């Protein structure tokens, strides 16, 4: 294996998960599909024209001489007759089309007269706008384009739909201008991967040199997989690099026969399919640098749930709420296990760069901050630890007044003060501070604060709107006064400011690299706690099901899961200063979780004891955090029912 080919694979895979890759397919896939080839059609033209195919001596001249002789001597109706005779057969496609489309191209540009690629596009499930003529660009529905240079036979079997004659290529500048403009735009914008030809599409190669002579090294060097079974002339490879081409030979991977190129057409692309970044990571400094580049842009937060961590690592491991790690889809090197093995030995900790060693210690401090303790096999006993540093959690109201009145320098501290101001009833003032935070963090090289400020701005807009509507109605009945504390100025201003403002677009709103680094933050993007309430409900069914009869929840028990999920969600919401803790559904979540825990405590204290209970206490102890959770998120009738139960 060659490391330049490895980083070429890296570049096209990051382009693929970016979605900015476009496959060009030449004419080799017709040869794989046993389609009627073009050179035997030239042989058919040679036997009908000269009255004999003879030896033929079919050359590059004869590729573009014989059909011209057919056109001028025998007319155009015999061309249509031969075209009907030779290009009417049909055949099912190959797996090669499926694994070409499996990399999810944004657009696909082809130079084969058949329509097997369109059928495979319908087989994949997605829809692509077929662009084969100049009129097709007008009715171009989808943003995903099927661009067609050679045309097809969907417009009948006339000569104008096809393009094979040389004067057609001469007139091609005026015949298909907008197709060429689309082609130039796609090769300028997206990474283009070349396949299906044998370095003979020389007009297209001159177009490639045209964009080379119009863009120099700013043009990204496109990739072609050489499918010729012979060894490649390396001087010609360097010349193609001087032309600006990155060629990867199939025979460099494996080579057998010449007709097995179809298998070679799979094989390198098979190497593309299961291409994993952690597959090639073979040394420990690469592991710590890889996890630094994968984690360390998440330094800006305060607390993140462990169950979010599976979004980072492609679900290769399961990270449960106790703090252990289970291998789930990790099929390459065991880099997390090797990471904890490096944590086991200080001698292995010495065998590293000291910049990388202090990076390792900083990530160790991060993992102890989030309480990740070993794998499930490595860990033994575990401790339930509770810590909240939020000023609003403990109700330090006057201390929050002093901190609001204090000096505001950091925009992160400005965000914390805006969360305090929302929590201390200065909602329009907090909205103004959020807007100024956005205006300051326009170009502050971290969109995390921008994302949080936009979410809290939308939530406080909805909070102000629902508050003023409840002020409009029964509050007049309750107080004997309309007692409106607001005026319509900022109401109309936030109305026009939040007009056509959705919430799910916001995760799309950030740039591509922000999505690629912060997909873990998708949870904040209108269905708050929906999946977590689903998990609470199914655990509620399980807890009542084992409550209905005798049971012995050995080791891990579901009340520990409920309690840890509760405290994990509460610490993640409070510590990162998200206003949505004020809302009613989160209060319903706390109500259901705490009531189930209380009922579990009652059933534990009241149950009968058989011999295995004598062969095997653990009563629940209330805490100050539990007292806060009781006071914040309950209603008098529900705790009256708790008294009744």
């Amino acid at each position: 294996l060659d490391n330049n080919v490895v980083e070429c694979i890296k570049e096209i895979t990051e382009s693929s998960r970016n979605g900015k890759l476009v496959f060009f397919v030449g004419a080799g896939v017709s040869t794989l599909s046993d389609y009627p080839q073009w050179w035997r059609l030239v042989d058919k033209y040679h036997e009908e024209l000269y009255g004999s195919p003879k030896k033929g001596n079919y050359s590059s001249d004869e590729y573009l001489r014989i059909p011209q002789i057919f056109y001028n001597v025998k007319g155009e109706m015999a061309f249509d007759g031969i075209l009907k005779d030779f290009f009417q057969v049909d055949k099912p496609t190959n797996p090669i089309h499926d694994k070409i489309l499996a990399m999810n191209p944004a657009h696909v540009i082809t130079t084969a007269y058949d329509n097997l690629i369109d059928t495979a596009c319908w087989k994949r499930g997605k829809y692509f706008s077929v662009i084969s003529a100049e009129e097709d660009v007008a009715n171009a529905t989808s943003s995903r384009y099927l661009l067609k240079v050679a045309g097809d036979f969907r417009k009948g079997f006339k000569g104008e739909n096809v393009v094979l004659k040389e004067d057609d290529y001469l007139n091609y500048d005026q015949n298909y201008p907008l197709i060429s403009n689309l082609m130039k735009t796609i090769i300028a914008t997206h990474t283009i991967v070349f396949i299906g030809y044998g370095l003979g599409d020389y007009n297209i190669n001159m177009l490639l040199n045209w964009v080379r002579k119009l863009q120099k090294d700013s043009f990204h060097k496109p990739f072609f997989i050489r499918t010729d079974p012979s060894p490649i002339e390396n001087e010609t490879l360097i010349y193609y690099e001087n032309k600006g081409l990155r060629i990867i030979d199939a025979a460099s991977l494996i080579d057998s026969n010449e007709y097995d190129y179809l298998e070679r057409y799979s094989a390198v692309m098979d190497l593309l399919i299961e291409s994993q970044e952690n597959k090639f990571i073979t040394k420990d400094d690469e592991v710590i640098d890889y996890i630094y580049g994968k984690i360390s842009p998440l330094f800006a937060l305060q607390y993140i749930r462990k169950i979010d961590l599976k979004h980072v690592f492609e679900y290769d491991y399961h990270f449960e709420v106790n703090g252990t790690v289970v291998r789930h889809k990790n099929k390459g090197f065991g880099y997390m296990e090797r990471f904890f093995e490096l944590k086991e030995s200080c001698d292995e900790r010495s065998k590293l760069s000291k910049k990388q060693y202090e990076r390792f210690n900083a990530l160790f401090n991060f993992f102890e901050k989030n309480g990740v303790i070993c794998m499930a096999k490595d860990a033994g006993t575990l401790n339930t630890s509770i810590e909240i540093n939020s000023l609003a959690y403990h109700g330090k109201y006057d201390v929050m007044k002093k901190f609001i009145e204090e000096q505001s320098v950091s925009i992160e501290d400005d965000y914390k003060k805006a969360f305090f101001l929302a929590c201390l009833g200065r909602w329009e003032e907090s909205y103004d501070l959020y807007s100024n935070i956005i205006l300051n963090s326009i170009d502050e090289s971290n969109g995390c604060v921008y994302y949080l400020s936009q979410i809290n701005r939308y939530r406080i807009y909805q909070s102000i709107t629902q508050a003023v509507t409840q002020f409009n109605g029964l509050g007049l009945l309750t107080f004997g006064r309309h007692y409106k504390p607001f005026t319509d100025e900022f109401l109309a201003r936030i109305e026009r400011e939040m007009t056509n403002f959705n919430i799910d677009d916001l995760f799309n709103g950030m740039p591509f690299e922000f999505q690629k680094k912060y997909k873990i933050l998708e949870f904040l993007s209108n269905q708050f706690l929906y999946d977590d309430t689903v998990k609470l409900f199914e655990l509620t069914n399980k807890v009542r099901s084992e409550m209905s009869e005798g049971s012995y929840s050995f080791g891990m028990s579901s009340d520990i899961v409920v309690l840890l999920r509760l405290y994990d969600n509460l610490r993640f919401l409070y510590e990162n200063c998200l206003w949505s803790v004020s809302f009613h559904e989160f209060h319903q979540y706390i109500r259901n979780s705490m009531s189930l825990l209380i009922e579990k405590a009652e059933y534990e204290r009241t149950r009968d004891i058989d011999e295995l209970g004598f062969s095997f206490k653990s009563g629940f102890f209330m805490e100050y955090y539990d007292f806060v959770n009781i006071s914040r998120h309950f209603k008098i009738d529900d705790i009256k029912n708790l008294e009744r139960s």
């Binding site: 909805q462 409840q470 109605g473 029964l474 007049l476 009945l477 004997g480």
Partner: protein, 108 residues
Amino acid sequence: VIQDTADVYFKRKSDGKLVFTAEAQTASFSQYILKSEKEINLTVKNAFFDLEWLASERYEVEYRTIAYDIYIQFPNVSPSGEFEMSLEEIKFEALADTDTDEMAVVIE
């Protein structure tokens, strides 16, 4: 026999003026000198408030349905306010006067 879909008119002891009209969904009755406390709770939907009335205080509730002409009157009531907020109903409780502790009037 009762169709169990009653309608509620909510009035005020001053002027006999109608405050709103609704329909109730949940009602809860719960518990020498024999002392016994009884509590009443009522829950109605989003009512029809009167804009004429837009142009503490004691209020009354009447609760009408048909049994085949059955009318209920609660003279003293308080609309306790519960402020909530959410993404994308009015509750009452009884009041018993200390002069003549009566709560329910039934006209059949």
